[PDB]
């Protein structure tokens, strides 16, 4: 079997997603600081809900469907969760966490368990700033209305950050009836990811990724040191010449995958100096994915 | 899919410095009501046309009309009589069919053009007709004034040569491309040949900005691109509707 | 006979490790303070459990398999543990703490007692603060669904923390019959180690070693200072030239083994200096492994 994990980040731009939520005057950004300096931003659960609401424009079944009529948020479940008779929102049925017995285990023999085959982790910004706010106001009708609001006008101040952050993941999966397909599906939406993190008509964003890389596809779990590329410049290059050497006679490499920003402006005679076991080199991220793809799934 | 990524314009003719180089000015929610009143000089009366000295109340926003009131016809009251659920069923919903981000200064700031990225991906939830008759008048004419309180307004030709893009759905052409002195937005990305590589375009040329602002060999861009001045931007959205 | 220990430690990574669970409406992490700081986390018998369950991927007979079908955590075994028979667990036929007779001392000789030659300790990390959280939400399905799961929606946060903590080990144990492809089939295992502390689909974390230094392999033991390369630098070759100096003549050393990331990045002409008995240095933690394994188990 084969496991692959990769890494990407995200082309710079103003972004602000309120995450905590500590007072109501005031909308709260950060969430870890580290070495003395705050950087990170958003929850990897998030960009699950992102995937699974994704997955429905490419044609799949579902069951977990998010709907707001009530003022409690809601999502309804189909019938049963069953990971074979359809994509069961990608294998992912979910414990029966009551004691109401009518479990399948009884007549499907369904053992209340996922078929999770996936793994993410938190984004991790690039720069600790997060002082500065845009100081607008909110008014009120005040027209005769027949509904009131809040019956004030007032002055917030939201927060704002102008960084690029970066995102690893890892699958490390196996194949087997009718899921090919849905894995080569969930890799194809993984390249656009956009409407991330809840709604954001204000605040313009996407996840639209730029020099990502692939490692270790062929080879059992070895990975290392998946925050390595950051401060706006390349460094998962000089990490594959140090360590699994390009030469296969002192430090053995492996087969690896690289993005197109790197290679968009860089030394054309360092592309044929980095021809060792020739690597694999492209210049849009859509078409090294199809590769990957096709080769790791073995179709 | 059948939705228009941005279509980053600019202005070649207040937070200071947020980083070392750059800054924003221009919040969000200012175009919004600029483009509020341009939507009345149109012929298209909305529901919440406050004089904006008086603010008004119409009634309830049960009916989508008129661009939904301009994407923001919701209540969140505590009863609402109760929430409008009798026969009306309008639960505090939210269209969001355009979407915009801060505008910056290209310019760093001493001790004047800007740009505005959209998104109006709406797939089939703009396209239907209550949608389709507004759209290709509100929204395509893209000329008017902002601010209005202080000399504040720029609405200029200059925008990036971006169509239709279905066979991929929303996806990165760049963000924010000054290119007042650099004219690099292409970032060389040409689908002059497709066998062996840079396939990356799909044919979104028209007459952009810098045809006759600037002199280059573009003759053999249009040539190479076969892709579909001021006024014709217009046009593009209504020649694909 | 020669006796070997060694210490290792990862690539840092925000991680979560839910330990303690005090009470439902917050997951605590901290287990252990030292001088007014709290810095550790993870017990043994996880990396036990760990390495349980990764010696089966390599192809080894196996007793105590855990299946999740009944409410209560359940693991099965064989007929009975037979240390020679077979892998044995690696070795580890465990006590039988009942009077129903049927012993195989009757029988078969068989003591009830291990084999245990193993020996480890719990991690410590070098970060304390453990301030921040994530503050994120469970919804209510509510959606006519024939199963209910809370008949609520509550808000509850995390606790995530940004640290690289290390890991010490000692074997000093002796080969038998069909034995040293056991210990060698472990020493394999032990360089990637992943899937500690059970599954993590949203804080995706790993045991890939970097800096791992072995100690005093030929005589009896003698380790001093476990846990001590902190503080994200190299701290044992001051050591290795303070205590047992390099030079023969006032102060006699031993031969001892040192990782890469060590090696990565300090002066070449400190590197041919640290060369009086040249000691062992390497690129990668896997030859390292693979060359001490050779060396140690005498084939």
């Known amino acids: 079997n084969l496991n692959l994990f990769a890494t990407i980040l995200t082309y710079p731009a103003p972004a602000s997603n309120y995450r905590g939520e500590s007072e109501e005057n005031r909308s709260v950004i950060q969430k870890i600081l580290k070495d003395g300096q705050k950087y990170a931003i958003i929850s990897p659960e998030s960009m699950r809900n992102a995937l699974r609401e994704m997955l429905i424009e490419l044609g799949q079944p579902n069951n977990r469907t998010r709907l707001h009529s009530e003022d409690q948020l809601a999502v309804e479940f189909k019938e049963y969760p069953n990971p074979d008779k359809f994509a069961d929102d990608f294998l992912f049925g979910y414990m029966v966490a009551q004691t109401n017995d009518a479990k399948e285990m009884k007549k499907l023999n369904r053992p209340a368990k996922r ?20 100081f607008y106001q909110s008014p009120l009708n005040a027209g005769d209305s027949a509904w009131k609001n809040s019956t004030s006008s007032a002055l917030l101040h939201r927060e704002v950050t102008h960084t690029a952050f970066q995102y690893p993941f890892a699958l490390a999966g196996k194949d087997c009836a009718a899921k090919p397909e849905w894995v080569k599906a969930l890799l194809q939406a993984i390249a656009e990811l956009n409407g991330v993190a809840g709604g954001h008509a204000r605040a313009y964003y996407e996840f639209a990724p730029r020099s990502v890389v692939a490692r270790l596809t062929p ?25 699994t ?55």
């Not at 078929?115 to 845009?134: E, G, H, Q």
């Not at 059992?220 to 594959?240: C, H, I, K, M, P």
């Open 115 to 134: 078929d999770s085959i996936f793994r993410c982790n938190m984004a991790v910004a690039v720069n600790p700033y997060k002082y500065d706010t845009v």
């Open 219 to 243: 080879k059992l779990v070895a990975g290392y040191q998946t925050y390595g590329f950051d401060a706006e410049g390349n460094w998962l290059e000089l990490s594959r010449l140090t360590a």
């Open 245 to 299: 050497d390009s030469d296969n006679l002192d430090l053995p490499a492996n087969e690896f995958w690289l993005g197109g920003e790197l290679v968009r402006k860089m030394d054309q005679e360092q592309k044929a100096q980095l021809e060792a076991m020739g690597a694999h080199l492209y210049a849009n991220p859509e078409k090294l994915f199809a590769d990957l793809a096709d080769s790791f799934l073995g179709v």
